[PDB]
Amino acid sequence: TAKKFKVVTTFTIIQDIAQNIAGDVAVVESITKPGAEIHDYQPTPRDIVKAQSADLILWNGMNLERWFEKFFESIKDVPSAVVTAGITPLPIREGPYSGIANPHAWMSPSNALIYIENIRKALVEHDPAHAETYNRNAQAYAEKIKALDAPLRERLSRIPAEQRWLVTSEGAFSYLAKDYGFKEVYLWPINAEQQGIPQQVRHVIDIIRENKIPVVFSESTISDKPAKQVSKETGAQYGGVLYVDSLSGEKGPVPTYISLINMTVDTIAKGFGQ
Ligand SMILES: [Zn+2]
CA pair distance 240, 219, nearest whole angstrom:
8
Looking at the structure, tell me whether residues 110 and 238 fall in a common domain: no
> Domain boundary at 123, 138, 157, which?
157
102: nearest Cα among 272, 248, 244: 244
> Domain boundary at 108, 142, 157, which?
157
Experimental method of this PDB entry: X-ray
Distances (CA, A) of 229 to 9, 190, 218, 223, 234: 35, 19, 11, 11, 9
Resolution in A: 1.4
**Distance (Å) from CA 103 to ligand 1 centroid:** 8
Q: Which residues pair with residue 153 across a beta bridge?
A: none
Which residues contact residue 117 at a Cβ distance below 8 angstroms, ignoring those fewer than 6 apart?
86, 138, 142
**Distance (Å) from CA 141 to ligand 1 centroid:** 24
Largest Cα span, the chain: 63
Which residues have C-beta under 5 Å from ligand 1, the single-atom ion?
A: 170, 172, 191, 245
> Domain boundary at 157, 180, 204, which?
157
260: nearest Cα among 248, 268, 249: 248
Looking at the structure, tell me whether residues 203 and 115 fall in a common domain: no
Q: Which regions of the chain does DSSP assign to beta strands (E)?
A: 5-9, 26-30, 56-59, 80-82, 165-170, 183-188, 215-219, 237-242
Could you list the residue range(s) of the whole structural domain that residue 194 is in?
A: 158-272
Q: Is 170 annotated as a binding residue?
A: yes
Q: Which regions of 20-178 does DSSP assign to beta strands (E)?
A: 26-30, 56-59, 80-82, 165-170
